[PDB]
Write a protein that binds this ligand. Structure first.
Ligand SMILES: Cc1cc(N2CC[C@](C)(c3ccccc3)C2)cc(=O)n1CCNC(=O)NC1CN(c2nccn3cncc23)C1
Lengths: 215, 214
């Protein structure tokens, strides 16, 4: 029901600026001046930092600013500071007393060099197929920041069910890793041309594809 | 200033739990604009109540919201494991302000033990073509969320090259993790087999895979 799209992540080093977007439709974002932005440090209560597109509540520094053009609102955070590292969400009203939220953007203040993920996609192992399971696994390692989005395709169609992705965890080399897995039945696996795992990190996407084989 | 919520609340499966949200005459007690949100750790939240008592579409009627004076309450009946989460309240006040409480972590006590499903995968053709032979041991559907992993090369302990991720809770309310062993193709092809041994609650599950015959 929400139409609000936010990029999954953004990053900068201390003292840089970052702008993040919140795209809706004419009936929500573009239909009034009612966009809000909220900051949440993980595991703590969120806070309203912008209301009515551009207004800061008391105590929010003027490094945070909000604007809008058409059906896209934008939050800019100049002068990045360590405390800015957080998840940011938008909202907008959208007709018939409805409030709509974006999916959130994780903003990292870079604490180490950026590292793109190594992505390995594994087809079903012989043992699990003999157990009537065709789970595929997409291994994603050695990445920084530790924010990664994963999507799967059956052929070219988005896969809407049976997907799980672990929360990225910092490994012994101090880069993050995670796994996404898609719990297919053998029929599903053998009857499609292929399945693909798409990993998005720092706004660039990598795709890996596998297909059934006989042995 | 925050609204006041207890930091913790708990209940057993099927039982009920009530949590409160105490504000002031100019926020919670000033109008009917109290909302509640649910949030699983590491996930986006979900609005479960608005305007004190109203459920958005898709919210079960086991969640109920009320207010008396300056204190709003949320009651979750028929507790289920998927209800184990953090719960925040909010209430618009004057001057375009929006106040939030500090969050209550609701724990659903006594969730059942569950042993891991372990699937070991051998190196993919693509990665072998790129001169890599990482193996992955997928570990899912377990509870509670602590496992240890050891790897074997033939029968011998593997002391290097192992990473295991920190278990995270998944949509079925049980944990998952992967352990991955970064072999060279030469290490992979020179052994009879590799094994992934997963220990959970004193019990071990071992899987073994060997270089393919095709
Ligand atoms: C997501 C969400 C956020 C939140 N907050 C965040 C602000 C808040 C005040 C907060 C923050 C922290 C802790 C506590 C509270 C309220 C409430 C909420 O209820 N939620 C779910 C509903 N809304 C969305 O999840 N939108 C999503 C993307 N979105 C879509 N965007 C475009 C097209 N789409 C087609 N299908 C889906 C989408 C998926």
């Amino acid at each position: 029901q929400s139409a609000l799209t936010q990029p999954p992540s953004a990053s900068g080093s201390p003292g840089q600026s970052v702008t993040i977007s919140c795209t809706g439709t004419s009936s929500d974002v573009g239909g009034s001046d009612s966009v809000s932005w909220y900051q949440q440090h993980p595991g703590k209560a969120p806070k309203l930092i912008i209301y009515e597109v551009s207004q800061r509540p008391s105590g929010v520094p003027n490094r945070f600013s909000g604007s809008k053009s058409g059906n896209t609102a934008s939050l800019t955070v100049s002068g990045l500071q360590a405390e800015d590292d957080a998840d940011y969400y938008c909202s907008s009203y959208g007709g018939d007393n409805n409030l709509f939220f974006g999916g959130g953007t994780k903003v990292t203040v870079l604490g180490q060099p950026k590292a793109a993920p190594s992505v390995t996609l594994f087809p079903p192992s012989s043992e699990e197929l003999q157990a009537n399971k065709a789970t595929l696994v997409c291994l994603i390692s050695d990445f920084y920041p530790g924010a990664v989005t994963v999507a799967w395709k059956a052929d070219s169609s988005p896969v809407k069910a049976g997907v799980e992705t672990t929360t990225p965890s910092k490994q012994s080399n101090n880069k993050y890793a995670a796994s996404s897995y898609l719990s297919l039945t053998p029929e599903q696996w053998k009857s499609h041309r292929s399945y693909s795992c798409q990993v998005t990190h720092e706004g660039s996407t990598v795709e890996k594809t596998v297909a059934p084989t006989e042995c």
